């Protein structure tokens, strides 16, 4: 299954959901890359909540 | 089972929208009326080898 992400959708996720941007700030530039981060989030329960 | 994501940087959306429209015209051509149904075959030459 494939989901298509646009940059505007990423910005809407950041503005509408500060928890995702909060994880993005201390997760992406430090440990793992952005597509890995988004796949982890999409496989996580926080996305479901 | 598996999760695959696709991230666009707001610069490649034209590619898959072009893919969508060429798929649409491809299925339109595949569901199109054939040329001998929409046109009269009387005046043209007879069928052969």
């Amino acid at each position: 299954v494939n989901v298509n992400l646009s940059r505007e959708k990423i910005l809407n996720i950041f503005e509408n959901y500060p928890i995702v941007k909060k994880a993005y700030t201390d997760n992406v530039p430090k440990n793992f890359k952005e597509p890995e981060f988004w796949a982890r989030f999409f496989s996580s329960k926080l996305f479901r909540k | 089972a598996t999760l695959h994501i696709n991230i666009t940087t707001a610069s490649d959306e034209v590619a898959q929208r072009e893919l969508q429209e060429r798929q649409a015209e491809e299925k339109r051509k595949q569901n199109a009326v054939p040329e001998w149904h929409k046109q009269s075959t009387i005046g043209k030459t007879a069928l052969g080898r």
């Binding site: 890359k33 597509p35 890995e36 796949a39 496989s43 | 089972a1 598996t2 695959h4 991230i7």
Partner: peptide, 24 residues
């Protein structure tokens, strides 16, 4: 079954990351 689910998920993520790095 459990370990294959975990490894297929993490290597699918790693392959998506590698594809994204190769495209950029």
């Amino acid at each position: 079954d459990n370990i294959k689910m975990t490894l297929q998920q993490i290597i699918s993520r790693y392959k998506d990351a590698d594809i994204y790095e190769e495209k950029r």
